[PDB]
Design a binder for this molecule. Structure first.
Ligand SMILES: [Ca+2]
Length: 231
């Protein structure tokens, strides 16, 4: 009857989300602002992102992973493995290196936490060693998004988790641009967190445009469900 974590209880209903990103890729500076809502009961996110600095100097798809895994649906039998909600409201630090095959890399640091009743994701992104006419700076990536598995393991030493996964970005010629993700999350607060057994998040994302929106932007619908442990 008691929740597996105090934080879990913060997610039983619809939660408004704000996303703020400042980025610099190969010296191209940009900012992204996002608003929407999440409903963890259904592993559901709906968000609209706008590039507030003009044209985005990288493809929108390359920023999806960076731009709230606390909205994942953990099945009841797996709720003792939900690190993300357990760190709330104080939140967690989420860091990644995203290595684009035969191209540059993003390094990201984010803090995900509640501000009032709003779930906020604040991110700094740094991109280096991109090729001027590779798939990223050359904008050769299709505006779509594949379905992936995010493999999570406990990091007991750090009182947190790691994740490893491979993102596949479709290239306009029919090929694929791999983006290898290595990920670390650690709690911001001093409260206890849930350290999970090995499992994965199964993700699915749909990208669209707002037909009235003139700014460079991305509308996103995403479903994420934890899996990999039986009852
Ligand atoms: Ca165990």
């Amino acid at each position: 009857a008691i929740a597996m974590s105090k934080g879990e209880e913060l997610f039983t209903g619809v939660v408004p989300i704000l996303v703020e990103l400042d980025g610099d890729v190969n010296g191209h500076k940009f900012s992204v602002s996002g608003e929407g809502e999440g409903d963890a009961t259904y592993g559901k996110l709906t968000l609209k992102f706008i590039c507030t600095t003009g044209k985005l100097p990288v493809p929108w798809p390359t920023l999806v992973t960076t731009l709230v895994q606390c909205f994942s649906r953990y099945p009841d039998h797996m709720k003792q493995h939900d690190f993300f909600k357990s760190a709330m409201p104080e939140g967690y630090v989420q860091e990644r290196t995203i290595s684009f095959k035969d191209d540059g890399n993003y390094k990201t640091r984010a803090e995900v936490k509640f501000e009032g009743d709003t779930l906020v994701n604040r991110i700094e992104l740094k991109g280096i060693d991109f090729k001027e006419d590779g798939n990223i700076l050359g904008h050769k990536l299709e505006y779509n998004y594949n379905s992936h598995n995010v493999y999570i393991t406990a990091d007991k030493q750090k009182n947190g988790i790691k994740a490893n996964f491979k993102i596949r970005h479709n290239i306009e010629d029919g090929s694929v641009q791999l983006a290898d993700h290595y990920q670390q999350n650690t709690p911001i607060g001093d409260g206890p967190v849930l350290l999970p057994d090995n499992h994965y998040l199964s993700t699915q994302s749909a990208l669209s445009k707002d037909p009235n929106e003139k700014r460079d932007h991305m509308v996103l619908l995403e479903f994420v469900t934890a899996a990999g442990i039986t009852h």
